[PDB]
Design an enzyme around this catalytic site. Structure first.
Site, mmCIF file in Angstrom:
data_model
loop_
_atom_site.group_PDB
_atom_site.id
_atom_site.type_symbol
_atom_site.label_atom_id
_atom_site.label_comp_id
_atom_site.label_asym_id
_atom_site.label_seq_id
_atom_site.Cartn_x
_atom_site.Cartn_y
_atom_site.Cartn_z
ATOM 1 N N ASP A 60 0.808 -1.219 0.000
ATOM 2 C CA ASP A 60 0.000 0.000 0.000
ATOM 3 C C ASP A 60 0.843 1.273 0.000
ATOM 4 O OD1 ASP A 60 -2.282 -1.595 -0.014
ATOM 5 O OD2 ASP A 60 -2.834 -1.147 2.058
ATOM 6 N N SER A 106 -33.965 -7.581 -22.667
ATOM 7 C CA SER A 106 -34.158 -8.611 -21.652
ATOM 8 C C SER A 106 -34.302 -9.963 -22.340
ATOM 9 C CB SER A 106 -35.366 -8.314 -20.767
ATOM 10 O OG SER A 106 -36.557 -8.372 -21.506
ATOM 11 N N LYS A 140 -26.892 -15.197 -13.445
ATOM 12 C CA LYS A 140 -27.619 -13.959 -13.697
ATOM 13 C C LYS A 140 -27.544 -13.127 -12.428
ATOM 14 C CE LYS A 140 -31.663 -12.108 -16.149
ATOM 15 N NZ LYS A 140 -31.730 -10.830 -15.386
ATOM 16 N N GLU A 183 -23.525 -5.644 -14.568
ATOM 17 C CA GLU A 183 -24.359 -5.348 -13.420
ATOM 18 C C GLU A 183 -23.508 -4.729 -12.319
ATOM 19 O OE1 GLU A 183 -26.710 -6.999 -15.027
ATOM 20 O OE2 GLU A 183 -28.557 -6.961 -13.835
HETATM 21 N N1 NMN Z 1 -1.528 -1.970 -2.895
HETATM 22 C C1 NMN Z 1 -2.132 -1.410 -3.962
HETATM 23 O O1 NMN Z 1 -1.670 -1.601 -5.067
HETATM 24 C C2 NMN Z 1 -3.342 -0.567 -3.792
HETATM 25 C C3 NMN Z 1 -4.095 -0.143 -4.897
HETATM 26 C C4 NMN Z 1 -5.216 0.649 -4.683
HETATM 27 C C5 NMN Z 1 -5.558 1.001 -3.387
HETATM 28 N N2 NMN Z 1 -4.828 0.587 -2.355
HETATM 29 C C6 NMN Z 1 -5.211 0.978 -1.000
HETATM 30 O O2 NMN Z 1 -6.641 1.190 -0.945
HETATM 31 C C7 NMN Z 1 -6.942 2.374 -0.173
HETATM 32 C C8 NMN Z 1 -7.770 3.379 -0.993
HETATM 33 O O3 NMN Z 1 -7.074 3.847 -2.153
HETATM 34 P P1 NMN Z 1 -7.842 4.412 -3.458
HETATM 35 O O4 NMN Z 1 -8.949 5.423 -3.025
HETATM 36 O O5 NMN Z 1 -6.822 5.099 -4.424
HETATM 37 O O6 NMN Z 1 -8.513 3.200 -4.164
HETATM 38 C C9 NMN Z 1 -5.598 2.959 0.320
HETATM 39 O O7 NMN Z 1 -5.356 2.497 1.653
HETATM 40 C C10 NMN Z 1 -4.574 2.343 -0.656
HETATM 41 O O8 NMN Z 1 -3.309 2.149 -0.032
HETATM 42 C C11 NMN Z 1 -3.752 -0.168 -2.516
HETATM 43 N N1 1X8 Z 2 -30.459 -9.169 -20.320
HETATM 44 C C1 1X8 Z 2 -29.371 -9.943 -20.498
HETATM 45 O O1 1X8 Z 2 -29.008 -10.269 -21.627
HETATM 46 C C2 1X8 Z 2 -28.534 -10.346 -19.367
HETATM 47 C C3 1X8 Z 2 -28.665 -9.991 -18.076
HETATM 48 C C4 1X8 Z 2 -27.680 -10.507 -17.221
HETATM 49 C C5 1X8 Z 2 -27.479 -10.337 -15.816
HETATM 50 N N2 1X8 Z 2 -28.341 -9.572 -15.071
HETATM 51 N N3 1X8 Z 2 -26.453 -10.913 -15.203
HETATM 52 C C6 1X8 Z 2 -25.572 -11.674 -15.825
HETATM 53 C C7 1X8 Z 2 -25.687 -11.928 -17.186
HETATM 54 C C8 1X8 Z 2 -24.694 -12.754 -17.917
HETATM 55 N N4 1X8 Z 2 -23.448 -12.969 -17.440
HETATM 56 O O2 1X8 Z 2 -24.983 -13.223 -19.003
HETATM 57 C C9 1X8 Z 2 -26.756 -11.319 -17.897
HETATM 58 S S1 1X8 Z 2 -27.173 -11.418 -19.600
#
Ligand code: NMN
Ligand code: 1X8
Ligand code: NA
Ligand code: NA
EC number: 6.5.1.2
Length: 321
Positions: A38, A87, A119, A174
């Site tokens: 980190d 859908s 899904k 999603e």
């Molecule tokens: N070790 C890593 O590569 C790495 C990457 C992204 C965030 N972090 C940690 O996550 C926390 C939040 O950072 P960010 O808001 O930039 O995602 C911090 O404590 C940071 O040190 C670590």
């Molecule tokens: N409406 C759609 O075609 C889909 C809807 C979703 C959903 N809610 N979550 C996963 C998948 C998936 N990995 O295929 C799909 S595909």
């Protein structure tokens, strides 16, 4: 007392830092295997902040600093979907799924492999990238027009700000709230005198429709991406390859997918993950079954509303189990 970096040096250094920090964040959040500690990440992050403070013109959309939140919108712009977010046709029984396969084989003239996936029960999103840079995040809305929630989605750490290649793609998936964060959030809301969320889908939707990104940043959300609107720029020729490719270029994809060489294997998958459903940290409402080969998906085509190459097998609701 002269500043060490010229504008040109700072520009190149900023590019290096954004690429490196985005890579480290992807390792940390998505791969869950950080190659650096980190304090190394934090040190480079601070360097980038200091460059952006000195040279504000260098602030770009792919910058890690653009995640933190702070921005507050007056409202959401509409976000049209040039390619509809459709859908799927549904099935509920063994009979329905074997009937699906019968209709597929009738059309294709041979047995077919199926890409089987969970899904995910969250908020459907579309993520637009141009030249490998995140430019628009959108809710599904009615499938034709949603809301532009780009700034909110930047706060979701699994959403990549850059891709490993400079392609223009529109990526669908999603965004959900993990079950453990959902129950904690409702308790927090209870204590703050706020209305509770009925379920994790409502909590994810409510979270992403907040206008203040600082509030959205406080919520715990994650993503699974599974396809694109137009595969032109992609190299995949099958749905399973597509999933591996999305993963390779920086997206979080669901690790439970399986390529089934027969309808029997498809049925065994449905049974396997009905049982596993309770053990997952995210909600699912079913299984999606897709003809794997793109050439065959192309041959089957669509009805007026849905693919003729896919079906969603629906379980009972999460509340019911
Ligand atoms: N070790 C890593 O590569 C790495 C990457 C992204 C965030 N972090 C940690 O996550 C926390 C939040 O950072 P960010 O808001 O930039 O995602 C911090 O404590 C940071 O040190 C670590
Ligand atoms: N409406 C759609 O075609 C889909 C809807 C979703 C959903 N809610 N979550 C996963 C998948 C998936 N990995 O295929 C799909 S595909
Ligand atoms: Na968050
Ligand atoms: Na179970």
């Amino acid at each position: 007392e002269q500043q060490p970096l010229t504008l040109t040096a700072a520009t190149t250094r900023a590019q290096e830092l954004r690429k490196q920090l985005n890579q480290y964040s992807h390792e940390y959040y998505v791969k869950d295997q950080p190659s650096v500690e980190d304090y190394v990440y934090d040190r480079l992050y601070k360097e980038l902040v200091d460059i952006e403070t000195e040279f504000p013109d260098l602030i770009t959309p792919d910058s890690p600093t653009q995640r933190v939140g702070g921005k507050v919108l007056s409202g959401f712009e509409k976000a049209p979907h040039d390619i509809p977010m459709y859908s799927l046709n549904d099935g509920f029984s063994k009979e329905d799924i074997f009937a699906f396969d019968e209709r597929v084989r009738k059309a294709i003239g041979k047995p077919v492999a199926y890409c089987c996936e969970l899904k995910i029960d969250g908020l459907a999103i579309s993520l637009r990238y141009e030249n490998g840079v995140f430019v628009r995040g959108a809710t599904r809305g009615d499938g034709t027009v949603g809301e532009n929630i780009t700034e909110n989605l930047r706060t979701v750490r699994s959403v990549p700000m850059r891709l490993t290649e400079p392609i223009s793609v529109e990526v669908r998936g999603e965004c959900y709230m993990p079950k453990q964060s959902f129950v904690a959030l409702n308790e927090e809301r209870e204590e703050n005198g706020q209305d509770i969320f009925a379920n994790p889908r409502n909590a994810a939707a409510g979270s992403l429709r907040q206008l203040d990104t600082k509030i959205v940043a406080k919520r715990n959300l994650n993503t699974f991406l599974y396809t694109v609107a137009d595969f032109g720029p992609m190299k995949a020729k099958t749905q399973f390859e597509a999933l591996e490719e999305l993963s390779a270029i920086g997206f979080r994809t669901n690790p439970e997918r399986q390529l089934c060489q027969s309808i029997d294997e498809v049925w065994a998958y449905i049974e396997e993950y009905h049982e596993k459903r309770s053990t997952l940290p995210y909600e699912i409402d079913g299984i999606v079954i897709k003809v794997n080969e793109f050439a065959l998906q192309d041959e089957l085509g669509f009805t007026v509303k849905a693919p003729r190459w896919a079906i969603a097998y629906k379980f009972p609701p999460e509340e019911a189990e």
